[PDB]
Amino acid sequence: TATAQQLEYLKNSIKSIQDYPKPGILFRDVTSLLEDPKAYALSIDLLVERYKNAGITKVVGTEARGFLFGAPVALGLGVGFVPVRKPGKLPRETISETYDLEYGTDQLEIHVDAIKPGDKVLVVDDLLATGGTIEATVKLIRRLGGEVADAAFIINLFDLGGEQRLEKQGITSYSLVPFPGH
Amino acid sequence: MTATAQQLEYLKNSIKSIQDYPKPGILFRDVTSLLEDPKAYALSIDLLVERYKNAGITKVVGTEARGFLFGAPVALGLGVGFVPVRKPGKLPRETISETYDLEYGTDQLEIHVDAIKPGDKVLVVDDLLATGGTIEATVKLIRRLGGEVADAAFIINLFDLGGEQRLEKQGITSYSLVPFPGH
Numbered sequence: 007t008a009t010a011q012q013l014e015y016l017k018n019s020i021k022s023i024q025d026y027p028k029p030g031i032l033f034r035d036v037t038s039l040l041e042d043p044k045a046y047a048l049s050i051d052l053l054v055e056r057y058k059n060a061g062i063t064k065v066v067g068t069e070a071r072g073f074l075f076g077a078p079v080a081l082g083l084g085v086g087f088v089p090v091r092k093p094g095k096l097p098r099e100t101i102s103e104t105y106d107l108e109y110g111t112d113q114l115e116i117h118v119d120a121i122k123p124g125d126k127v128l129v130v131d132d133l134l135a136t137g138g139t140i141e142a143t144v145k146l147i148r149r150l151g152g153e154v155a156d157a158a159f160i161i162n163l164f165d166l167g168g169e170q171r172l173e174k175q176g177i178t179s180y181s182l183v184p185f186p187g188h
Numbered sequence: 189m190t191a192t193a194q195q196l197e198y199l200k201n202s203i204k205s206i207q208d209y210p211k212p213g214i215l216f217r218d219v220t221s222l223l224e225d226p227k228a229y230a231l232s233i234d235l236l237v238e239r240y241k242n243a244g245i246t247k248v249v250g251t252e253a254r255g256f257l258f259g260a261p262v263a264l265g266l267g268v269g270f271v272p273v274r275k276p277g278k279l280p281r282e283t284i285s286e287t288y289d290l291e292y293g294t295d296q297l298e299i300h301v302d303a304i305k306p307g308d309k310v311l312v313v314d315d316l317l318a319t320g321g322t323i324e325a326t327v328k329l330i331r332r333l334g335g336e337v338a339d340a341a342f343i344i345n346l347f348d349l350g351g352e353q354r355l356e357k358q359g360i361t362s363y364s365l366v367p368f369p370g371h
C-alpha cells in the first residue's frame with residue numbers, strides 16, 4: 007500500500023549507530039523517528055490502517071519502547087491498551103512469562119483481568135529481533151483465553167529469523183522498515 | 189477547556205487504587221484500568237491536547253515508562269515530536285543525566301543532547317504528580333539543553349504532597365485531570 011517516498015522517509019528517519027552498545031553492533035535507533043512528527047504520525051497511521059478491519063478488541067504493547075507504538079495504535083483502532091511490563095511494576099494480580107536475553111533471561115507480566123475469552127489482540131512493539139519478548143507476550147495472552155494471530159512492528163531485523171519463529175506460534179508479523187544485519 | 193463533572197467522575201472512577209503497593213501505607217493509583225477503557229483513555233488524551241493546542245509547543249517530553257503512555261498520544265495530537273526521558277543506559281546517542289532523591293535511594297534520568305535545541309518550547313507529560321522530584325529532574329535536563337519549559341501535564345495529582353506548588357516555584361504550571369488525596 008505505502009509509497010516508495012513514504013517507506014524511504016520512514017527508513018531515513020531511523021538513525022543507525024555503529025559500535026553501540028559494543029564494538030561490531032549497528033544499533034537501529036527509533037528515537038529519531040519519534041522526534042520527527044511526520045515520521046511518527048505516518049508510522050502510527052500505517053499500522054492502524056493495516057488492522058482497521060481485523061476485529062481487534064485490545065492492543066498489547068511491550069515495555070517500554072513498544073508503549074510508544076502500541077498505545078497510539080490502540081487509540082487509532084478505538085480499543086483498550088494493555089501493557090506487558092518488567093516484573094514488579096504492575097500493581098494488581100499478574101501472570102509471568104520468561105524469555106531469553108543476549109545474557110541470561112527475564113520476565114514479562116500482564117494483569118490477569120486485562121484479557122478475557124472473546125478478546126482478539128494485536129501485539130505491537132518497536133522492533134522484531136529474536137522475537138523472544140513477543141513469544142512470551144503471546145503466551146501471556148493465550149493463558150488468559152485471548153486470541154492473538156497478529157504482531158506489528160516499526161522495524162524488522164530480518165536476518166534474525168524472528169518472523170518465521172512467530173509464524174510457528176500462529177502469529178503473522180507486519181513491519182514498516184526492514185533492516186539487514188545481526 | 190476543563191472536564192465536566194461527568195467527565196471528572198468517569199476518569200476518577202476508571203482509576204483503580206491498590207493499598208500497600210509498592211510498600212505499606214501508600215494507596216497506589218493505577219492508570220492501567222484507565223488505559224484498558226477506550227472511553228477513559230481517549231477522553232484523557234483529548235483533554236490534555238485541548239489544553240495546549242494554542243500554547244506553541246514544539247516538543248513533548250514523556251518520562252519512562254508510564255509517562256510514555258500519555259506523552260506520546262499528546263505529541264501526536266499536537267503534531268509535534270516526542271522525546272523520551274529514560275532510565276540510564278537505554279538511550280543510544282549522546283546523553284546528559286540528572287540524579288534525584290527517592291524515599292529509599294537515588295534515581296537517574298537521561299535525555300538525548302540533540303533532542304532539545306535553544307528556542308524549543310517543551311511540554312512535559314507524566315501519569316501522576318507526587319512530590320514533583322521526577323518532573324523537577326526532567327525540567328533540569330530540558331533547561332540544560334536550552335529548551336524553554338513552563339508547562340507540565342498529568343492524569344493524576346496527589347494534592348497532599350504539594351508537587352504543584354514545588355513546580356510553580358520553578359516556573360512550571362501544572363495541569364492535572366484527577367486529584368486524589370493521600371500519599
Ligand SMILES: Nc1ncnc2c1ncn2[C@@H]1O[C@H](COP(=O)(O)O)[C@@H](O)[C@H]1O
Nearest residue numbers: 031032033034107108135136137138188
Ligand atoms: N535496536 C537494535 N538495533 C540493532 N540490533 C538490535 C537492536 N535491538 C536488538 N538488537 C540485536 O538483536 C539481538 C538481541 O535480540 P533481542 O534479545 O531479541 O533484543 C542482539 O543481536 C542485539 O544486538
Ligand SMILES: Nc1ncnc2c1ncn2[C@@H]1O[C@H](COP(=O)(O)O)[C@@H](O)[C@H]1O
Nearest residue numbers: 215216217316317318319320321322371
Ligand atoms: N500513590 C501513587 N500512585 C501511583 N504512582 C505514584 C504514587 N506516588 C508516586 N507515584 C509515582 O512515583 C514517581 C515519583 O513521583 P514524584 O514524587 O512526583 O517524583 C512518579 O512516577 C509518580 O508517578
Ligand SMILES: [Cl-]
Nearest residue numbers: 069070071072
Ligand atoms: Cl525499551
Ligand SMILES: [Cl-]
Nearest residue numbers: 100101102103
Ligand atoms: Cl505466572
Ligand SMILES: [Cl-]
Nearest residue numbers: 252253254255
Ligand atoms: Cl513507570
Ligand SMILES: [Cl-]
Nearest residue numbers: 205368369370
Ligand atoms: Cl481516595
Ligand code: NA
Nearest residue numbers: 029030031188
Ligand atoms: Na555481532
Ligand code: NA
Nearest residue numbers: 189238239241
Ligand atoms: Na474546541
